Amino acid sequence: GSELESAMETLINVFHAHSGKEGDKYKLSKKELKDLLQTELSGFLDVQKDADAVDKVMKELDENGDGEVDFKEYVVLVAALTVACNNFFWETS
């Protein structure tokens, strides 16, 4: 419903926050991306704890290789993983 609309709105809010946190126009540098991540998902997600994972995620997110992430890429993949977690939780765990 409008609640799901507000969910997309929250995604957009959090994105634009860290896109301008370091001033990277509207696109997440490696540092913006890291800080973003450990801010939004405290717990299940790791960037400081897993810097090699952060680097591999930099490469994977930036298939284009730009090193910056716009809205499409992370929305797709991050939404997929973050929702599929609970689907697995119900299924088995």
Residues forming the site for a copy of itself (CB under 8 A) = 1-12, 14-15, 26, 39-44, 71-72, 75-76, 78-87, 90
66 binds, among a copy of itself, other proteins, Ca ion, none (CB under 5 to 8 A by kind): Ca ion
SS3 41: coil
14 binds, among a copy of itself, Ca ion, other proteins, none (CB under 5 to 8 A by kind): a copy of itself
Q: What are the residue ranges of helices labelled H in 2-50? A: 2-21, 30-40
* Integer Cα distance of 77 and 79 in angstroms: 5
SS3 69: strand
State residue 28 phi and psi, 5-degree precision: -90, 110
Give contact residues for other proteins (rule: CB under 8 A): 1-3, 6, 13, 16-17, 20, 24-25, 41, 43-47, 53, 57, 81, 84, 86, 88-90
